[PDB]
Design brief:
Layout (H helix, E strand, L loop, with lengths): L5 E3 L7 H14 L3 E4 L4 H14 L2 E4 L5 E4 L13 E4 L20 E2 L1 H9 L10 E9 L6 E7 L2 H10 L1 E2 L1 H7 L5 E6 L22 E5 L4 E5 L4 H4 L2 H17 L2 E3 L2 E6 L5 E7 L6 H5 L9 E6 L3 E5 L5 E4 L4 E5 L9 H6 L5 E3 L2 E3 L4 E2 L13 E2 L5 E2 L13 E5 L16 E9 L9 E3 L3 H9 L2 E3 L3 E3 L12 H10 L10 E5 L19 H11 L5 E4 L2 E4 L14 H5 L3 H19 L5 H15 L2
Parallel strand pairs: 1-2, 2-7, 4-20, 5-6, 5-11, 8-10, 10-12, 15-26, 26-30
Antiparallel strand pairs: 3-4, 7-8, 7-9, 11-12, 13-17, 14-15, 14-16, 17-18, 18-26, 19-25, 20-25, 21-22, 21-23, 23-24, 27-30, 28-29, 31-32
Helix pairs in contact: 2-4, 10-15, 14-15
Bound molecules: ligand TSX and manganese (II) ion (MN).
The ligand C=CCn1c(=O)c2[nH]c(Cc3ccc(NC(C)=O)cc3)nc2n(CCCC)c1=O binds next to α8.
Length: 603
């Protein structure tokens, strides 16, 4: 029966639990074939070739083994609306707000989800191959393993880069447990609807669901990576944050980097930023300060767990970078540019006529007669009034290829976090850098995060779309870390690269010069008496920030804290947290809200 549909591998060499998961979902989805992924170069070559034949990928001949996927324009981003967590009780998933609808996640009842599942999954893979992806989140060797079933070869190839994938994962798994991951593009053959750019999706029925009690992730109708690469946001943030809450650790939307001063002293820092803040540019930043070194552990997700000496240790559970393409250049991110030179999948970027990539802000003058095809497969000029690349277009690239990849990026011990950075995009009022007054205040600073998307929105811990459970409880869990025995708590900082003058010009040059801010953090961690007290925390004392080699910087306006601005700010923060977190807001946070208005009242 089922064996006859297998086109690669053998049912018999799957652990019983993997086999049963496959059997149940094959019976349900009715795929024409089953391909058990081995994760070999040869398999990758084959799937890339097949995808080229079918129009899903084009070859980018300018480079060594680079490819380009163009999507249906309806399927270009994750949809928060259609992203749900399923629990017996709503409160376990999101706080019940005081007014309005929750902005802290989306809950669906078990009953509603069973209905939603039956209207989508039966027969969904008809005419397609079901791929079986064994993957490890974190280095191969305890780490969490999952099995993703998908009808998308694009997902297979992306998973190979973004996770450890294939036969060795099944070998490490044995009869262990795994997260069950089910994905379909939702377009059974014969196609009932038009195919755009050979890219199957079902936007109307798109649903990305998490069932934490069953250890199941179920995703329908979208091929876009945030929705389809189930190890990443779905597992390593949402489900894991839940597990972490239970087991006394932390799963966070954080880059991790290692920074070394000119005397050879090295610290690791984790940072959470909302979108459009240049996460990845900071993760592999090339520092301008002489003698300094920055190395990249990860640009997206961090798993953090206290060791026996109370140090918070971080592992990057990913195997790659799924980076925003537009804005990437030799100037803004020289390390990303070298990373993506080979073995990289690009999605929704433009293509030059010599088979190179192009996007807004690539800052690379075209040769004579070279022209650009846009991401909607049209000839493109700068007079079109339309970007050549989609704003959310991506590169998907092996982490091992980053020239400053950290030597301990795959250490199963993890790397000791000495500082946590929170930040946002704030055109007014928020200084370039400040330090939390205490752990409790640092939790509040994370909880208070807002960022410009032209709208300024709340995005606490940069986790707004990613909480796996009640944010009030997530806040209590963060607070609880100050009572871990002998905890060596990271110093907490808040940054803003994006403060502007009245004409909208950026006050801080940023990029490589951000090394000057990390320098201040670095020395503060080491106890340097370099702080000046303000109502919002510590800022750099006068002349403490290293400005050697820069043009003029308006330091006064950059570090300016206005009573009027901060009155408006704390009112907005209180309002947001009391309303949205309501009965689940920990009283330590209530105290921090009051303490801040009290400090502001005194100015
Ligand atoms: C480690 C670097 C992080 N970083 C920054 O530090 C940063 N700072 C800015 C604002 C800025 C933009 C352009 C200039 N250019 C010139 C010439 O002054 C200066 C500041 N944009 C920044 N960006 C781009 C974010 C959008 C994807 C950014 O990524
Ligand atoms: Mn992210």
């Amino acid at each position: 029966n089922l064996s006859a549909k297998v086109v690669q591998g053998s049912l018999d060499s799957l652990p019983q639990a993997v086999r049963e998961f496959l059997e149940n979902n094959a019976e349900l989805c009715q795929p024409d074939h089953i391909h058990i992924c081995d994760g070999s170069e040869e398999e990758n070559g084959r799937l890339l070739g097949q995808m080229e034949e079918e129009g899903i990928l084009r070859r980018l001949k300018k480079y060594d083994n680079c490819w380009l996927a163009l999507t249906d324009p309806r399927d270009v981003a994750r949809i928060e609306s259609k992203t749900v967590i399923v629990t017996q009780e709503q409160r376990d998933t999101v706080p019940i707000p005081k007014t309005g609808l929750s902005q802290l996640g989306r809950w669906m009842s078990e009953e509603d989800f069973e209905k939603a599942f039956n209207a989508r999954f039966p027969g969904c893979m008809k005419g397609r191959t079901m791929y079986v992806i064994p993957f490890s989140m974190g280095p191969l060797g305890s780490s969490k393993i999952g099995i993703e079933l998908t009808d998308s070869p694009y997902v297979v190839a992306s998973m190979r880069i973004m996770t450890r994938m294939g036969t060795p994962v099944l070998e490490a798994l044995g009869d262990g447990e795994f997260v069950k991951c089910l994905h379909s593009v939702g377009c059974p053959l014969p196609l009932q609807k038009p195919l755009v750019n050979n890219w199957p999706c079902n936007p109307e029925l798109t649903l990305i669901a998490h069932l934490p009690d069953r250890r199941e992730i179920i995703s329908f109708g979208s091929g876009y990576g945030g929705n389809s690469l189930l190890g990443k946001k779905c597992f390593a943030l949402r489900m894991a944050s839940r597990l972490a809450k239970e087991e006394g650790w932390l799963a966070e939307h954080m880059l991790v980097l290692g920074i070394t001063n000119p005397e050879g002293e090295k610290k690791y820092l984790a940072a959470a930023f909302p979108s459009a803040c240049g996460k990845t540019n900071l993760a592999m930043m090339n520092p301008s300060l002489p003698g300094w070194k920055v190395e990249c552990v990860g640009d997206d997700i961090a798993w953090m767990k206290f060791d026996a000496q109370g140090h918070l240790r971080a592992i990057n559970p990913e195997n790659g970078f799924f980076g925003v393409a537009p804005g990437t250049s030799v100037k803004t991110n020289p390390n990303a540019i070298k990373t993506i030179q080979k073995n990289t999948i690009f999605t929704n970027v433009a293509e030059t006529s010599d088979g190179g990539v192009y996007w807004e802000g690539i800052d690379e003058p075209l040769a004579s007669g070279v022209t650009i095809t846009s991401w909607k497969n049209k000839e493109w000029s700068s007079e079109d009034g339309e970007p050549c690349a989609h704003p959310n277009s991506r590169f998907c690239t092996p982490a091992s290829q980053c020239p400053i990849i950290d030597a301990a990026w795959e250490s199963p011990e993890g790397v000791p976090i000495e500082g946590i950075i929170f930040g946002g995009r704030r055109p007014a009022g928020v200084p370039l850098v400040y330090e939390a007054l205490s752990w409790q205040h640092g939790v509040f600073v994370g909880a208070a995060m807002r960022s410009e998307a032209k709208i300024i929105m709340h995005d606490p811990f940069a986790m707004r779309p990613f909480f796996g459970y009640n944010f009030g409880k997530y806040l209590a869990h963060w607070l609880s870390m100050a009572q871990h025995p002998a905890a060596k708590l990271p110093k907490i900082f808040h940054v803003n690269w994006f403060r502007k003058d009245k004409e909208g010009k950026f006050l801080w040059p940023g990029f490589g010069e951000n090394s000057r801010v990390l320098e201040w953090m670095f020395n503060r961690i080491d106890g340097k008496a370099s702080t000046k007290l303000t109502p919002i925390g510590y800022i750099p004392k006068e002349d403490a920030l290293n400005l050697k080699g820069l043009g003029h910087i308006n330091m006064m306006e950059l570090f300016s804290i206005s009573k009027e601005f901060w009155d408006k700010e704390v009112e907005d923060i209180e309002k947001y947290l009391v309303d949205q977190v309501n009965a689940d807001l920990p009283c330590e946070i209530e105290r921090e809200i009051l303490a801040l208005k009290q400090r502001i009242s005194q100015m």
